[PDB]
Write a protein that binds this ligand. Structure first.
Ligand SMILES: *Cc1c(COP(=O)(O)O)cnc(C)c1O
Ligand SMILES: *Cc1c(COP(=O)(O)O)cnc(C)c1O
Lengths: 448, 437
């Protein structure tokens, strides 16, 4: 009869058999015109001879043997898939991510294929826009965009681990989303995850995910400097890979959110993509994904972008208003490089201004993170300057689920935040247990 | 919205309310446009689709048509519920629907947990909670709010929607209402207010009433206000909701490339859910998409309701909360009901979380059930099993925090993983890592 599958399972590559044409390597970020320096992804590598960032470079020549149409159709034939690799919004674009990993080593939770919402009501009643979308990277297994990166990173690591290569585990020194996504993926695969922290930076609340995921969290008696000293001293005496902010392998998974944005728009290029970004790699990552789609010819243009920044966070904005003539190569260089290439813009949000944009977006039905506030603030501003027209297809990237920011909204709505009006707050309304009284609170609210 | 909009439609499809499990041959049917709530017996209602019209198209036609909507960003179609419109609210205009593209939820392979804890290789968790609101309720509210939107749009007296819930239904409800500009009203006793628990409705600009009484007298004012004004009270036991929800069963099949799982595990807090799944699978069977329907399991919290007692006694003592639905369902798919003590559900949670997950206590209740089923040998190690996760784990942190710090009264917390203290000394640190690795 209807053979569903063979009793036992565990689990189509765009390439010549018994000989995979694609490959990638580590190269220095935006290296010289004629440079040879490289590293295998199999090497545990963090900087480049000069102490500079690394960037994963894919063999563009291999990929190009196959035309634009080839790749749109290949990627499109994997939408809706339930198979070991293809499910993931990252692995479905494996060839352009980690072309050489065996599917047996991938560590996926089916990240990607992220909600691309249409802010009909917010666009209209607030910006006069009819084609504003929000890309919910936060609606994932972890609560953030960081799952795109960790899937790749943990895959690469699981690969080195299974090759009898030496990697006993993964280390980290973060109390946020990276630590959460990193501990998650590692746990699914059975790879130890170690978090290193000064004891004065422990918060059961902030570490709920790694703790829940089985991470070995060290609460160390020293400050951050002394904690970094140990990490460095440990990793050098134990093959433990540190997942660092600067890791370029995470960028290979994050770049898929851009490809996906194009995919979801049935390969049409948006006029503007706003990337929030306390973390400067997020925007380069998007740029890399949009650039790659174009290099390979899946589309003809790359979208203009916005690096929306929180007030006084970094000097990125100061640099932009003065056409970067005071710039010199938090990793700004990748942001700058990326904004140059796409003729981008950088814009700001005050602390009060992001909370208000959040209340406005939230009143429209969304339940967003501070960074989307910054993004939307950037948008409300760029709109007044006539830089973003009303009919302009704009996508705002949301990197973390709103459920991670409740305490922020609570404080706001109950007018409990210092230095801020909290003008759009909606606290509950007090009323006597009297019929008529209640009919009044109601009659007005609503109207007549 | 302006895209699919062309006149082509002389809409062959339709639906209406009929009493739940209607006696053989019944003229009793109300229009979905009406605001009804009980049948004539005082009994429940159900949304019956006209299986007649729907059958002029085969299984192949249905599997193909839905699959063509996957990955789509078209007006209603982006949605995991609207992609299945024809079987949800076939008569609503596209301009009426209120959607945030809910659905198309993650179907995760619990590879590690399955193998390491049960000896199962094809255990999947359907994360209905990873969404806009953080719960399964989006599925249901998109439909309710849509239908409410429609009645209203027809310059119809519907000044607002009301609720007397501090949970998920309310969060989902106020979200949909806000996107639509439909006032949402939460009525509550002053002693149940919590900025914490009402964070989402509040954020969503719902009009939250903090009334100076208790629950009973609060229920009274709602009765009073609703007879004077057309505020549609989001029935708990409301039937438009199940129409939205059934699509999660449909999605599960669509997800296995139209293949039927051997077991679906629904953590039955709200009994309508398990019945919603069955409705979804049985609809795919009748219409010829698949050929079987999965056996199911209603996972309960120990002592929740008489459901379990009714089950351990082959439903011999049962008479027709919304228990009947569950019964009717578990009978038709030769289902099972199973219990989870407070402790059991937490430990399971700690075991699933340890494998990469980060789940709500109901999935704790499902896995517990699964664990017992595997022992009794009822569920086989190679059975394609799907556990349904109804709420996002981020809404249950305090639970885990307390569990992982050994502070939950009358429970061991066998799997607490608290952070470990060590001095800032290299041997000291090397020692602890040595044993751990
Ligand atoms: C999120 C992110 C970081 C920072 O991680 P935290 O855990 O929030 O410190 C650094 N680099 C990249 C590329 C990131 O995405
Ligand atoms: C959630 C739900 C309800 C009621 O909401 P609460 O938050 O549980 O009060 C009623 N019926 C069904 C089917 C539900 O899923």
């Amino acid at each position: 009869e209807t053979a569903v599958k063979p009793p036992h399972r565990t689990e189509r590559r765009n390439r010549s058999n018994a000989v995979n044409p694609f490959s990638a390597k580590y190269v220095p970020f935006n290296a010289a015109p004629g440079s040879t320096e490289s590293y295998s992804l199999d090497e545990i590598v963090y900087r480049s001879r000069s102490g500079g960032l690394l960037d994963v470079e894919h063999d563009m020549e291999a990929l190009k043997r196959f035309d634009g149409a080839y790749w749109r159709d290949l990627f499109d034939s994997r939408v809706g898939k339930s198979t070991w690799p293809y499910g993931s919004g990252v692995w479905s674009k494996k060839e352009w991510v980690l072309p050489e990993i065996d599917d047996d080593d991938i560590v996926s939770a089916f990240e990607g294929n992220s909600n691309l919402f249409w802010a009909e009501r917010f666009g209209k009643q607030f910006l006069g826009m009819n084609d504003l979308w929000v890309k919910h990277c936060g609606i994932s297994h972890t609560g953030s965009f960081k799952d795109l990166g960790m899937t790749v990173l943990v895959s690469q690591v699981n690969r080195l681990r299974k090759m009898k290569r030496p990697v006993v585990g993964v280390g980290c020194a973060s109390t946020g989303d990276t630590s959460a996504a990193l501990s998650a993926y590692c746990a699914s695969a059975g790879i130890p995850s170690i978090v290193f922290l000064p004891a004065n930076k422990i918060s059961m609340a902030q570490l709920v995910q790694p703790i829940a995921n089985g991470a070995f969290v060290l609460s160390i008696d020293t400050d951050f400097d002394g904690c970094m000293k140990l990490i460095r001293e440990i990793t050098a005496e134990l093959p433990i890979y540190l997942a660092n902010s600067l890791n370029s392998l995470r960028l290979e998974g994050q770049k898929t959110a851009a490809i996906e944005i194009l995919q979801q728009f049935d390969w049409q290029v948006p006029d503007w993509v706003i990337v929030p970004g306390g973390n400067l790699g997020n925007i380069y990552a998007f740029y890399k994904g949009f650039k790659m789609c174009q290099e390979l010819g899946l589309v003809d243009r790359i979208p203009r972008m916005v690096c929306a920044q929180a007030a006084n966070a970094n000097p990125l904005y100061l640099h932009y208003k003065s056409g970067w003539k005071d710039f010199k190569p938090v990793s700004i260089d990748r942001a700058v490089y990326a904004l140059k290439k796409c003729n981008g813009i950088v814009e700001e949000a005050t602390e009060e201004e992001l909370m208000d944009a959040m209340a406005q977006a939230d009143s429209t039905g969304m339940f967003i993170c501070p960074h989307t506030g910054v993004a939307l603030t950037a948008l409300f501003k760029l709109r007044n300057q006539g830089v973003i027209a009303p009919t302009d297809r704009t996508v705002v990237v949301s990197t973390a689920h709103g459920l991670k920011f409740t305490q922020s909204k609570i404080d706001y709505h109950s007018n409990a935040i210092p230095d801020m009006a909290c003008r759009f707050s909606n606290p509950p309304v007090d009323v006597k247990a009297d019929f008529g009284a209640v009919m009044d609170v109601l009659k007005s609210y609503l109207g007549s």
